C-alpha cells in the first residue's frame, strides 16, 4: 500500500518487459491491471493513460511520471 512497496512493486512490472528503468505501456497494462484494475475502468482508455502519462515524449513511463498516475490512484 505504501509508496516503499509501490517502489518494489513497479520495478517487479518494469523488470518484467524491457528495462525496469522504463515503464511501457505494455508493462504499466499488467501492472494497472493489478495494481489498479479500477484505473482501466476510467475515461482513460489504456493509450490515454500511455500518452497521458507519458509526458517526457520518450516512451517510459519511470516512477518519475507515475507519480502522475498516484494523484488518480489517490482520488
Ligand atoms: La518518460
Redesign the pocket.
Known amino acids: 500500500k505504501s509508496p516503499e512497496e509501490l517502489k518494489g512493486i513497479f520495478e517487479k512490472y518494469a523488470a518484467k518487459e524491457g528495462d525496469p528503468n522504463?515503464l511501457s505501456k505494455e508493462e504499466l497494462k499488467l501492472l494497472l491491471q493489478t495494481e489498479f484494475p479500477s484505473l482501466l475502468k476510467g475515461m482513460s482508455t489504456l493509450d490515454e493513460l500511455f500518452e497521458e502519462?507519458?509526458?517526457?515524449?520518450?516512451?517510459?513511463?519511470?516512477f518519475?511520471?507515475f507519480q502522475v498516475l498516484v494523484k488518480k490512484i489517490s482520488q
Open positions: 522504463q502519462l507519458d509526458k517526457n515524449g520518450d516512451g517510459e513511463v519511470s518519475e511520471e
